[PDB]
Scaffold this active site. Structure first.
Site, PDB file in Angstrom:
ATOM      1  N   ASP A  31       0.804  -1.245  -0.084  1.00 41.73           N
ATOM      2  CA  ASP A  31       0.108   0.051   0.145  1.00 41.73           C
ATOM      3  C   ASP A  31       0.822   1.210  -0.030  1.00 41.73           C
ATOM      4  OD1 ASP A  31      -2.363   1.929   0.902  1.00 41.73           O
ATOM      5  OD2 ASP A  31      -3.381  -0.192   0.675  1.00 41.73           O
ATOM      6  N   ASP A  39      12.691   1.560   4.723  1.00 41.77           N
ATOM      7  CA  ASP A  39      11.887   1.704   5.807  1.00 41.77           C
ATOM      8  C   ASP A  39      10.729   2.092   5.147  1.00 41.77           C
ATOM      9  OD1 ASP A  39      10.469   3.322   7.711  1.00 41.77           O
ATOM     10  OD2 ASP A  39      12.113   4.494   7.985  1.00 41.77           O
ATOM     11  N   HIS A  54      -3.596   4.932   4.251  1.00 43.24           N
ATOM     12  CA  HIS A  54      -4.250   3.594   3.734  1.00 43.24           C
ATOM     13  C   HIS A  54      -3.591   2.506   4.293  1.00 43.24           C
ATOM     14  CE1 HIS A  54      -6.485   1.130   0.762  1.00 43.24           C
ATOM     15  NE2 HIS A  54      -7.445   1.853   1.328  1.00 43.24           N
ATOM     16  N   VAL A  99      -4.769  -0.274  23.846  1.00 43.15           N
ATOM     17  CA  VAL A  99      -4.679   0.182  22.797  1.00 43.15           C
ATOM     18  C   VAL A  99      -5.573   0.141  21.681  1.00 43.15           C
ATOM     19  CG1 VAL A  99      -3.407   1.617  20.834  1.00 43.15           C
ATOM     20  CG2 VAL A  99      -2.304   1.356  23.510  1.00 43.15           C
ATOM     21  N   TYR A 131      -6.037  -7.931 -11.522  1.00 41.71           N
ATOM     22  CA  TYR A 131      -5.612  -8.420 -10.315  1.00 41.71           C
ATOM     23  C   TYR A 131      -6.637  -9.146  -9.512  1.00 41.71           C
ATOM     24  CZ  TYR A 131      -2.139  -4.717 -11.463  1.00 41.71           C
ATOM     25  OH  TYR A 131      -1.278  -3.972 -12.494  1.00 41.71           O
ATOM     26  N   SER A 175     -11.468  -1.833   0.816  1.00 43.00           N
ATOM     27  CA  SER A 175     -10.007  -1.730   1.433  1.00 43.00           C
ATOM     28  C   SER A 175      -9.901  -2.514   2.693  1.00 43.00           C
ATOM     29  CB  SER A 175      -9.538  -0.177   1.488  1.00 43.00           C
ATOM     30  OG  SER A 175      -9.246   0.193   0.481  1.00 43.00           O
TER      31      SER A 175
HETATM   32 CA   LIG Z   1      -4.712  -3.325  20.833  1.00 41.13          CA
HETATM   33 CA   LIG Z   2      11.398   5.146   3.283  1.00 40.69          CA
HETATM   34 NA    NA Z   3      -8.701 -13.536  -7.831  1.00 41.93          NA
END
Ligand SMILES: [Ca+2]
Ligand SMILES: [Ca+2]
Ligand code: NA
Ligand SMILES: [Ca+2]
Ligand SMILES: [Cl-]
Ligand code: NA
Ligand code: NA
EC number: 3.4.21.75
Lengths: 5, 472
Positions: free
Chosen positions: B45, B73, B86, B102, B200, B260
């Site tokens: 993504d 990174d 996203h 959290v 895809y 998504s």
């Molecule tokens: Ca959590």
């Molecule tokens: Ca980077």
């Molecule tokens: Na497929």
């Protein structure tokens, strides 16, 4: 193209 | 006795568990002891906030890379509009840490989670290929919530490098068992888009996942097509709850939406399933999804029973994923036989389409040959045709067992005069059927216009095996 999704 | 997560937003994760049964039956899998330990998932993504307080504990640099800037990174690029949120939202659905006070929890909250930053820039074929082919002997499952434009007029799919990455992944990835590629089927519902026009999702190498709303309906953004395999919950109208996950800038969101969110949830369920049986192949995983997914209480006007007694919809595939059933069936699963491929060139001459064209062909499915198929998996109708207004075409394929797959529905915005150039329309709806017998291809003009064109090639491509069927 390629769109988020 | 299993102790469910204590995270502050877990009670809002209606789609994971609950007494109402409108859920993905994930707590049943957790209680069997499967939470994702030892499985590696990568989000392809716009990046992953690797220091997010609900992701850091499961973050895996080995499952991550930055293809846009060519560095290891995958940290998102921060902007005022938070455009690059996203990937982080997708990651938390798979593998948000549990019992840490959290936000909520991922489906596979003990799996390792990485991200490939590859959408934040020019997304070339090479960019896609290097992302799909990243560390394929370390990453088990790839999740992609992106694709060609959902304008309802695009026909586009993986170019050469990306297609090669798919074949290398399923053939040599994961020690030869095959990379698992999970794909969101698309958000083009408002444009009457078809997810078979997206190469895809339409690929046999991806598990294409659609969405259902909390009340069990087809969301406004949903694309219908025959290549979709199954469904997970996602967002709907403003009275229906949405998906809870990790957000950019170390925040928690309860407002993730669209297909998504469905692919990552499926990726998490598939991670639990792989933990239950690490020897599953890429095709095994699709068999498990077909056999365990649940149509019940998903509303659609096109539910049909295929030739082996399974209900299938173009909106939902085989229905909602069932994590508890997936992990249960995986444990004693017998690996499927090697994949066979039977190629049948149908036409002896080009055919004018006109108002309507029906092509009937009786096939033996490579009888007497090593690629003889009695147990279908995917089937493709690879079509080459010309037409003056592509979106006026509807295309259906009927299997010998009577299962009618919509390969292409009318697309009002597709004005293109470019037709289809050996486009491999795929259907999952005849899975486990015997493909021997009469196939019927139907091409019709859904408009009153005097449209014109010619079908010049129809290749029926059958994949499957010749052993190991169960009773319908
Ligand atoms: Ca959590
Ligand atoms: Ca980077
Ligand atoms: Na497929
Ligand atoms: Ca689409
Ligand atoms: Cl092939
Ligand atoms: Na292999
Ligand atoms: Na038959």
């Amino acid at each position: 193209x390629x769109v988020x999704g | 006795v299993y102790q469910e997560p204590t995270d502050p937003k877990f009670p809002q994760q209606w789609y994971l568990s609950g007494v109402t049964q409108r859920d993905l039956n994930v707590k049943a899998a957790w209680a069997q002891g499967y939470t994702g330990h030892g499985i590696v998932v990568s989000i392809l993504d716009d990046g992953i906030e690797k220091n997010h307080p609900d992701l850091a504990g499961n973050y895996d640099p080995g499952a991550s890379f930055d293809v846009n800037d060519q560095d290891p990174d995958p940290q998102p690029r921060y902007t005022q509009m938070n455009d690059n949120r996203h990937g982080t939202r997708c990651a938390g659905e798979v593998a948000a840490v549990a019992n840490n006070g959290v936000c909520g929890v991922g489906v596979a909250y003990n799996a390792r989670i990485g991200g490939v930053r590859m959408l934040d820039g020019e997304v070339t074929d090479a960019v896609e290929a290097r992302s799909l082919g990243l560390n394929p002997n370390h990453i088990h499952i790839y999740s992609a919530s992106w694709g060609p434009e959902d304008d309802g007029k695009t026909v586009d799919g993986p170019a050469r490098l990306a297609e090669e990455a798919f074949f290398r992944g399923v053939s040599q990835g994961r020690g030869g068992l095959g990379s698992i590629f999970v794909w969101a089927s698309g958000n083009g519902g408002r444009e009457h888009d078809s997810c078979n026009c997206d190469g895809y999702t339409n690929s046999i190498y991806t598990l294409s996942i659609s969405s259902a709303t909390q009340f069990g309906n087809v969301p406004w953004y949903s694309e219908a097509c025959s290549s979709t395999l199954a469904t997970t919950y996602s967002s709907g109208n403003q009275n229906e709850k949405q998906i809870v996950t990790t957000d950019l800038r170390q925040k928690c969101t309860e407002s993730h939406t669209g297909t998504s969110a469905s692919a990552p949830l499926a990726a998490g369920i598939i991670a639990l399933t792989l933990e239950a049986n690490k020897n599953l192949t890429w095709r095994d995983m699709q068999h498990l999804v077909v056999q365990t997914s649940k149509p019940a209480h998903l509303n659609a006007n096109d539910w049909a029973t295929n030739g082996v007694g399974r209900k299938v919809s173009h909106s939902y595939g085989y229905g909602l994923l069932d994590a508890g059933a997936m992990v249960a069936l995986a444990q004693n699963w017998t690996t499927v036989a090697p994949q066979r491929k039977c190629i049948i060139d149908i036409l002896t001459e080009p055919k004018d389409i006109g108002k309507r064209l029906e092509v009937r062909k009786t096939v033996t499915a490579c009888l007497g040959e090593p690629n003889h198929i009695t147990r279908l998996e995917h089937a493709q109708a690879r079509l080459t045709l010309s037409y003056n207004r592509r979106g006026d075409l509807a295309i259906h394929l009927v299997s010998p067992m009577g299962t009618r797959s919509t390969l292409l529905a009318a697309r009002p915005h597709d004005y293109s005069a470019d037709g289809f150039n050996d486009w491999a329309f795929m259907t999952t709806h005849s899975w486990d059927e015997d493909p021997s017998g009469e196939w019927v291809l139907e091409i019709e003009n859904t408009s009153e216009a005097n449209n014109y064109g010619t079908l010049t090639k129809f290749t029926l491509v059958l994949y499957g095996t010749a052993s190991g069927s169960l009773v319908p």
